[PDB]
RNA sequence: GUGAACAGCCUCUAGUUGAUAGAAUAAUGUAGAUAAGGGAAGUCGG
RNA sequence: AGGGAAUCUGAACGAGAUUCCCACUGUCCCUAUCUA
RNA sequence: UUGGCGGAAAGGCCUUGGGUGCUUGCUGGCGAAUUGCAAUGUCAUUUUGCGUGGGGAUAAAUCAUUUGUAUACGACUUAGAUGUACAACGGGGUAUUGUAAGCAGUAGAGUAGCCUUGUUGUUACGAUCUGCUGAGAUUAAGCCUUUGUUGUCUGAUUUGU
């Protein structure tokens, strides 16, 4: 089932007690793990714009709550994770603090 | 100082334990067992709530 | 260190079992000898001290007490033990025919995968005029020098996210073994309250598995913590009630409040049921199951005979710093706020 | 370029991202901090 | 626009040495916690 | 087959009877040999497996994920096949810091600037003070609570008296 939702992820919670040199790469791994939790598929692909969003404040200053657009799709022929992939994009907001997980209407 | 296992202190404490010192515990026990007997009747009323 | 507390190793389980019991008098009424709950909490009390001979006679003393949460223990069985030249030997246990979801959970390590087929043939074994159950109860009453009660805790009424209750064994110090096994017969599927075991001004010995600190480095390196410790002579200051509001109310304070602090205890919930407020500090941490036995012997000094006149219960915020007893006193002192109006 | 300054801190031109990785994060060890009250009582010897 | 005062040594000295007076500190009483 | 008894390892002891073979209590009649002059001459009792012909009974554990009362790793405590279930968010509390961003003002040193040469005259610049503002931010990661919204519920192995 190809379904797209949006999610606020508490990166203050997951990156708590993590060394300053390794927050941003872990934040990539935490977003991937979060998307694997919610979509039930292995291949979590990430937007290059989302990568720009994480790594904005260097390595030591990744934000507390980020609002994402995790999207289930269908993966093409010659695939090892058979046969669905998630794709995570950022969405524009002044503050991500205080948003409900909402199903995106596709047109 | 007299030890914890000093014979005379054990005998003086046995002089205590045959007086007030046990009687208060033997009154407290009766009050505890009383409320325990009171705890059967409440639950039996909640048996009769369903039996109604 | 202390060579008695050896080997300094990790315990068999979090629920430490009680090693010894209070003796026995064969003329006393039937009453429980040990109780269990869930230790979680610590708080400050003031009281006027009627301890004559002291430097604080007719003065006021502040002191630290601990709040063990104790939901009403439920009886689900009875054990009979024969006296042997080899110790004791359990010859027959008998159960309650219909047990909770909590205890049938205690019988499995993986609860969700199972067909939940625990006591199906045992309940079908009951399914008649008794006949075999009364046979095993005759077996207990005929022999078996001591009789212990199988109980369990009400885990769901406690804010713990565990769902899985603890089985225990509690002996009876009420004389005539007939009255022991027949008290049990009157108590299958039924529950036992706290204040039917304890009251105020009563010394107890709370046993607990002592707060694990893990690996540590003759004064030797190895394991520190997670040991099963028995601490004796902690005075019960208050027995409480769940339905009764104003548990935090004393003879003096008399404000309608629960002993539960603002935003609850740290790492543990509120209190929604019966509790014991014991003086000093019980071993183990918060969320820890403690088993409270009673004294072993007649332990009367003036530290055991005196009556406690509780003056005030501190219910201020333990999480952070303490400034207000009630939420009502926070917004009474504060005035009115932004999101209020 | 800021700055009184060859102090640093930031960059333009140009050139790199090479050094096994990943998962955990308890004690110990080395190094650096902070600490009630007292202020060398430590130690042969601040 | 860290002090100060004496003395032993080659009146100030010289990161000379010693002693004392004043100040300071986990050196210690007595360790506790955090980071790399 | 009627009970009674036995808890010290009871696991056995007595007893009520009906049937049922046998009895060397006593007396008869058959059969044995050639295993050749001896050769343990195998008749006991365990633990099983394959076959039979009848009864009976309808699992959990581990891995994987989670939990954190546990934790070097093991191990331990938890949680999860339609629920006062769990996960993510979300709200409410409790705490920590100390008045967020933005905007406005008559509060304004000192100045530029129109000349009505000012007795809060004026237009503008204008540290800071003041107000919206105990606000704003953070608040579980090892705090509490959950009538909100959204989703998950099924993968592999191993085990027999």
PDB file of N, CA and C in Angstrom, chain C residues 191-250:
ATOM      1  N   UNK C 191      -9.155 -11.221  48.428  1.00  0.00           N
ATOM      2  CA  UNK C 191      -7.994 -10.359  48.662  1.00  0.00           C
ATOM      3  C   UNK C 191      -7.802 -10.033  50.147  1.00  0.00           C
ATOM      4  N   UNK C 192      -6.560  -9.714  50.506  1.00  0.00           N
ATOM      5  CA  UNK C 192      -6.173  -9.322  51.862  1.00  0.00           C
ATOM      6  C   UNK C 192      -5.652  -7.885  51.815  1.00  0.00           C
ATOM      7  N   UNK C 193      -6.213  -7.035  52.675  1.00  0.00           N
ATOM      8  CA  UNK C 193      -5.797  -5.634  52.800  1.00  0.00           C
ATOM      9  C   UNK C 193      -4.490  -5.503  53.589  1.00  0.00           C
ATOM     10  N   UNK C 194      -3.905  -4.307  53.560  1.00  0.00           N
ATOM     11  CA  UNK C 194      -2.649  -4.017  54.260  1.00  0.00           C
ATOM     12  C   UNK C 194      -2.867  -3.914  55.769  1.00  0.00           C
ATOM     13  N   UNK C 195      -3.832  -3.081  56.171  1.00  0.00           N
ATOM     14  CA  UNK C 195      -4.138  -2.814  57.585  1.00  0.00           C
ATOM     15  C   UNK C 195      -4.731  -4.004  58.358  1.00  0.00           C
ATOM     16  N   UNK C 196      -4.958  -5.106  57.642  1.00  0.00           N
ATOM     17  CA  UNK C 196      -5.304  -6.403  58.228  1.00  0.00           C
ATOM     18  C   UNK C 196      -4.053  -7.242  58.552  1.00  0.00           C
ATOM     19  N   UNK C 197      -2.881  -6.681  58.247  1.00  0.00           N
ATOM     20  CA  UNK C 197      -1.575  -7.278  58.554  1.00  0.00           C
ATOM     21  C   UNK C 197      -0.804  -6.332  59.477  1.00  0.00           C
ATOM     22  N   UNK C 198      -0.811  -5.043  59.134  1.00  0.00           N
ATOM     23  CA  UNK C 198      -0.094  -4.019  59.893  1.00  0.00           C
ATOM     24  C   UNK C 198      -1.010  -2.950  60.491  1.00  0.00           C
ATOM     25  N   UNK C 199      -0.433  -2.135  61.371  1.00  0.00           N
ATOM     26  CA  UNK C 199      -1.031  -0.877  61.822  1.00  0.00           C
ATOM     27  C   UNK C 199       0.083   0.128  62.146  1.00  0.00           C
ATOM     28  N   UNK C 200      -0.296   1.294  62.670  1.00  0.00           N
ATOM     29  CA  UNK C 200       0.660   2.303  63.137  1.00  0.00           C
ATOM     30  C   UNK C 200       1.481   1.796  64.326  1.00  0.00           C
ATOM     31  N   UNK C 201       2.654   2.404  64.522  1.00  0.00           N
ATOM     32  CA  UNK C 201       3.545   2.143  65.670  1.00  0.00           C
ATOM     33  C   UNK C 201       4.096   0.712  65.748  1.00  0.00           C
ATOM     34  N   UNK C 202       4.108   0.030  64.605  1.00  0.00           N
ATOM     35  CA  UNK C 202       4.553  -1.356  64.519  1.00  0.00           C
ATOM     36  C   UNK C 202       5.900  -1.441  63.806  1.00  0.00           C
ATOM     37  N   UNK C 203       6.849  -2.125  64.442  1.00  0.00           N
ATOM     38  CA  UNK C 203       8.163  -2.376  63.853  1.00  0.00           C
ATOM     39  C   UNK C 203       8.053  -3.469  62.800  1.00  0.00           C
ATOM     40  N   UNK C 204       8.723  -3.255  61.670  1.00  0.00           N
ATOM     41  CA  UNK C 204       8.822  -4.258  60.606  1.00  0.00           C
ATOM     42  C   UNK C 204      10.250  -4.409  60.082  1.00  0.00           C
ATOM     43  N   UNK C 205      10.477  -5.507  59.365  1.00  0.00           N
ATOM     44  CA  UNK C 205      11.723  -5.749  58.636  1.00  0.00           C
ATOM     45  C   UNK C 205      11.475  -5.920  57.142  1.00  0.00           C
ATOM     46  N   UNK C 206      11.761  -4.853  56.401  1.00  0.00           N
ATOM     47  CA  UNK C 206      11.586  -4.823  54.955  1.00  0.00           C
ATOM     48  C   UNK C 206      12.801  -5.434  54.268  1.00  0.00           C
ATOM     49  N   UNK C 207      12.544  -6.451  53.447  1.00  0.00           N
ATOM     50  CA  UNK C 207      13.601  -7.145  52.706  1.00  0.00           C
ATOM     51  C   UNK C 207      13.559  -6.742  51.222  1.00  0.00           C
ATOM     52  N   UNK C 208      14.732  -6.466  50.646  1.00  0.00           N
ATOM     53  CA  UNK C 208      14.840  -5.955  49.272  1.00  0.00           C
ATOM     54  C   UNK C 208      16.166  -6.296  48.595  1.00  0.00           C
ATOM     55  N   UNK C 209      16.110  -6.509  47.280  1.00  0.00           N
ATOM     56  CA  UNK C 209      17.313  -6.667  46.463  1.00  0.00           C
ATOM     57  C   UNK C 209      17.926  -5.283  46.221  1.00  0.00           C
ATOM     58  N   UNK C 210      19.154  -5.123  46.703  1.00  0.00           N
ATOM     59  CA  UNK C 210      19.772  -3.815  46.899  1.00  0.00           C
ATOM     60  C   UNK C 210      20.389  -3.166  45.642  1.00  0.00           C
ATOM     61  N   UNK C 211      19.642  -2.228  45.050  1.00  0.00           N
ATOM     62  CA  UNK C 211      20.095  -1.296  43.983  1.00  0.00           C
ATOM     63  C   UNK C 211      21.428  -1.636  43.267  1.00  0.00           C
ATOM     64  N   UNK C 212      21.314  -2.303  42.117  1.00  0.00           N
ATOM     65  CA  UNK C 212      22.464  -2.746  41.324  1.00  0.00           C
ATOM     66  C   UNK C 212      23.319  -1.622  40.766  1.00  0.00           C
ATOM     67  N   UNK C 213      24.613  -1.673  41.072  1.00  0.00           N
ATOM     68  CA  UNK C 213      25.591  -0.712  40.562  1.00  0.00           C
ATOM     69  C   UNK C 213      26.530  -1.329  39.512  1.00  0.00           C
ATOM     70  N   UNK C 214      26.351  -2.623  39.247  1.00  0.00           N
ATOM     71  CA  UNK C 214      27.114  -3.346  38.225  1.00  0.00           C
ATOM     72  C   UNK C 214      28.526  -3.711  38.636  1.00  0.00           C
ATOM     73  N   UNK C 215      29.413  -3.767  37.643  1.00  0.00           N
ATOM     74  CA  UNK C 215      30.833  -4.064  37.837  1.00  0.00           C
ATOM     75  C   UNK C 215      31.537  -2.922  38.568  1.00  0.00           C
ATOM     76  N   UNK C 216      32.489  -3.282  39.430  1.00  0.00           N
ATOM     77  CA  UNK C 216      33.186  -2.331  40.302  1.00  0.00           C
ATOM     78  C   UNK C 216      34.645  -2.738  40.539  1.00  0.00           C
ATOM     79  N   UNK C 217      35.514  -1.738  40.689  1.00  0.00           N
ATOM     80  CA  UNK C 217      36.949  -1.952  40.910  1.00  0.00           C
ATOM     81  C   UNK C 217      37.511  -1.131  42.054  1.00  0.00           C
ATOM     82  N   UNK C 218      39.833  -8.551  51.849  1.00  0.00           N
ATOM     83  CA  UNK C 218      40.983  -8.197  51.006  1.00  0.00           C
ATOM     84  C   UNK C 218      40.761  -6.925  50.164  1.00  0.00           C
ATOM     85  N   UNK C 219      39.543  -6.371  50.239  1.00  0.00           N
ATOM     86  CA  UNK C 219      39.054  -5.268  49.380  1.00  0.00           C
ATOM     87  C   UNK C 219      39.180  -5.593  47.878  1.00  0.00           C
ATOM     88  N   UNK C 220      38.269  -6.446  47.407  1.00  0.00           N
ATOM     89  CA  UNK C 220      38.344  -7.036  46.067  1.00  0.00           C
ATOM     90  C   UNK C 220      37.376  -6.416  45.059  1.00  0.00           C
ATOM     91  N   UNK C 221      37.793  -6.429  43.791  1.00  0.00           N
ATOM     92  CA  UNK C 221      37.002  -5.935  42.660  1.00  0.00           C
ATOM     93  C   UNK C 221      36.005  -6.982  42.161  1.00  0.00           C
ATOM     94  N   UNK C 222      34.903  -6.513  41.577  1.00  0.00           N
ATOM     95  CA  UNK C 222      33.851  -7.384  41.050  1.00  0.00           C
ATOM     96  C   UNK C 222      32.490  -6.716  41.024  1.00  0.00           C
ATOM     97  N   UNK C 223      31.500  -7.381  41.617  1.00  0.00           N
ATOM     98  CA  UNK C 223      30.109  -6.914  41.631  1.00  0.00           C
ATOM     99  C   UNK C 223      29.793  -6.051  42.859  1.00  0.00           C
ATOM    100  N   UNK C 224      29.186  -4.886  42.620  1.00  0.00           N
ATOM    101  CA  UNK C 224      28.619  -4.054  43.689  1.00  0.00           C
ATOM    102  C   UNK C 224      27.127  -3.835  43.454  1.00  0.00           C
ATOM    103  N   UNK C 225      26.330  -4.146  44.475  1.00  0.00           N
ATOM    104  CA  UNK C 225      24.877  -4.012  44.409  1.00  0.00           C
ATOM    105  C   UNK C 225      24.180  -5.252  43.884  1.00  0.00           C
ATOM    106  N   UNK C 226      22.845  -5.189  43.869  1.00  0.00           N
ATOM    107  CA  UNK C 226      21.935  -6.273  43.440  1.00  0.00           C
ATOM    108  C   UNK C 226      21.961  -7.504  44.373  1.00  0.00           C
ATOM    109  N   UNK C 227      22.233  -7.248  45.655  1.00  0.00           N
ATOM    110  CA  UNK C 227      22.270  -8.281  46.694  1.00  0.00           C
ATOM    111  C   UNK C 227      20.974  -8.281  47.493  1.00  0.00           C
ATOM    112  N   UNK C 228      20.537  -9.462  47.927  1.00  0.00           N
ATOM    113  CA  UNK C 228      19.298  -9.571  48.699  1.00  0.00           C
ATOM    114  C   UNK C 228      19.548  -9.264  50.176  1.00  0.00           C
ATOM    115  N   UNK C 229      19.088  -8.090  50.612  1.00  0.00           N
ATOM    116  CA  UNK C 229      19.329  -7.607  51.974  1.00  0.00           C
ATOM    117  C   UNK C 229      18.071  -7.565  52.833  1.00  0.00           C
ATOM    118  N   UNK C 230      18.234  -7.977  54.089  1.00  0.00           N
ATOM    119  CA  UNK C 230      17.210  -7.861  55.124  1.00  0.00           C
ATOM    120  C   UNK C 230      17.614  -6.752  56.096  1.00  0.00           C
ATOM    121  N   UNK C 231      16.778  -5.720  56.186  1.00  0.00           N
ATOM    122  CA  UNK C 231      16.960  -4.660  57.174  1.00  0.00           C
ATOM    123  C   UNK C 231      15.820  -4.695  58.180  1.00  0.00           C
ATOM    124  N   UNK C 232      16.175  -4.726  59.464  1.00  0.00           N
ATOM    125  CA  UNK C 232      15.202  -4.897  60.552  1.00  0.00           C
ATOM    126  C   UNK C 232      14.932  -3.597  61.319  1.00  0.00           C
ATOM    127  N   UNK C 233      13.765  -3.533  61.972  1.00  0.00           N
ATOM    128  CA  UNK C 233      13.356  -2.428  62.869  1.00  0.00           C
ATOM    129  C   UNK C 233      13.123  -1.063  62.205  1.00  0.00           C
ATOM    130  N   UNK C 234      12.250  -1.045  61.202  1.00  0.00           N
ATOM    131  CA  UNK C 234      11.778   0.198  60.603  1.00  0.00           C
ATOM    132  C   UNK C 234      10.334   0.406  61.050  1.00  0.00           C
ATOM    133  N   UNK C 235      10.091   1.482  61.799  1.00  0.00           N
ATOM    134  CA  UNK C 235       8.760   1.758  62.346  1.00  0.00           C
ATOM    135  C   UNK C 235       7.780   2.225  61.269  1.00  0.00           C
ATOM    136  N   UNK C 236       6.607   1.589  61.237  1.00  0.00           N
ATOM    137  CA  UNK C 236       5.487   2.031  60.396  1.00  0.00           C
ATOM    138  C   UNK C 236       4.877   3.304  60.989  1.00  0.00           C
ATOM    139  N   UNK C 237       4.881   4.357  60.180  1.00  0.00           N
ATOM    140  CA  UNK C 237       4.376   5.659  60.582  1.00  0.00           C
ATOM    141  C   UNK C 237       2.916   5.859  60.195  1.00  0.00           C
ATOM    142  N   UNK C 238       2.549   5.397  58.996  1.00  0.00           N
ATOM    143  CA  UNK C 238       1.167   5.471  58.511  1.00  0.00           C
ATOM    144  C   UNK C 238       0.800   4.328  57.562  1.00  0.00           C
ATOM    145  N   UNK C 239      -0.383   3.762  57.787  1.00  0.00           N
ATOM    146  CA  UNK C 239      -1.042   2.887  56.820  1.00  0.00           C
ATOM    147  C   UNK C 239      -2.105   3.744  56.135  1.00  0.00           C
ATOM    148  N   UNK C 240      -2.129   3.701  54.804  1.00  0.00           N
ATOM    149  CA  UNK C 240      -3.034   4.538  54.016  1.00  0.00           C
ATOM    150  C   UNK C 240      -4.134   3.820  53.255  1.00  0.00           C
ATOM    151  N   UNK C 241      -5.015   4.617  52.650  1.00  0.00           N
ATOM    152  CA  UNK C 241      -6.159   4.117  51.886  1.00  0.00           C
ATOM    153  C   UNK C 241      -6.309   4.847  50.553  1.00  0.00           C
ATOM    154  N   UNK C 242      -6.655   4.089  49.514  1.00  0.00           N
ATOM    155  CA  UNK C 242      -6.776   4.609  48.149  1.00  0.00           C
ATOM    156  C   UNK C 242      -8.030   5.419  47.890  1.00  0.00           C
ATOM    157  N   UNK C 243      -9.175   4.868  48.302  1.00  0.00           N
ATOM    158  CA  UNK C 243     -10.484   5.530  48.183  1.00  0.00           C
ATOM    159  C   UNK C 243     -10.587   6.796  49.041  1.00  0.00           C
ATOM    160  N   UNK C 244      -9.931   6.764  50.201  1.00  0.00           N
ATOM    161  CA  UNK C 244      -9.893   7.884  51.130  1.00  0.00           C
ATOM    162  C   UNK C 244      -8.971   8.987  50.613  1.00  0.00           C
ATOM    163  N   UNK C 245      -9.576  10.126  50.281  1.00  0.00           N
ATOM    164  CA  UNK C 245      -8.852  11.372  50.036  1.00  0.00           C
ATOM    165  C   UNK C 245      -8.377  11.921  51.391  1.00  0.00           C
ATOM    166  N   UNK C 246      -7.427  12.860  51.351  1.00  0.00           N
ATOM    167  CA  UNK C 246      -6.788  13.452  52.541  1.00  0.00           C
ATOM    168  C   UNK C 246      -5.947  12.437  53.339  1.00  0.00           C
ATOM    169  N   UNK C 247      -5.149  11.662  52.604  1.00  0.00           N
ATOM    170  CA  UNK C 247      -4.145  10.765  53.183  1.00  0.00           C
ATOM    171  C   UNK C 247      -2.946  11.571  53.673  1.00  0.00           C
ATOM    172  N   UNK C 248      -2.623  12.633  52.934  1.00  0.00           N
ATOM    173  CA  UNK C 248      -1.582  13.591  53.306  1.00  0.00           C
ATOM    174  C   UNK C 248      -1.970  14.485  54.473  1.00  0.00           C
ATOM    175  N   UNK C 249      -3.258  14.482  54.817  1.00  0.00           N
ATOM    176  CA  UNK C 249      -3.763  15.214  55.971  1.00  0.00           C
ATOM    177  C   UNK C 249      -3.355  14.530  57.266  1.00  0.00           C
ATOM    178  N   UNK C 250      -2.868  15.343  58.195  1.00  0.00           N
ATOM    179  CA  UNK C 250      -2.546  14.904  59.547  1.00  0.00           C
ATOM    180  C   UNK C 250      -3.602  15.458  60.510  1.00  0.00           C
TER     181      UNK C 250
END
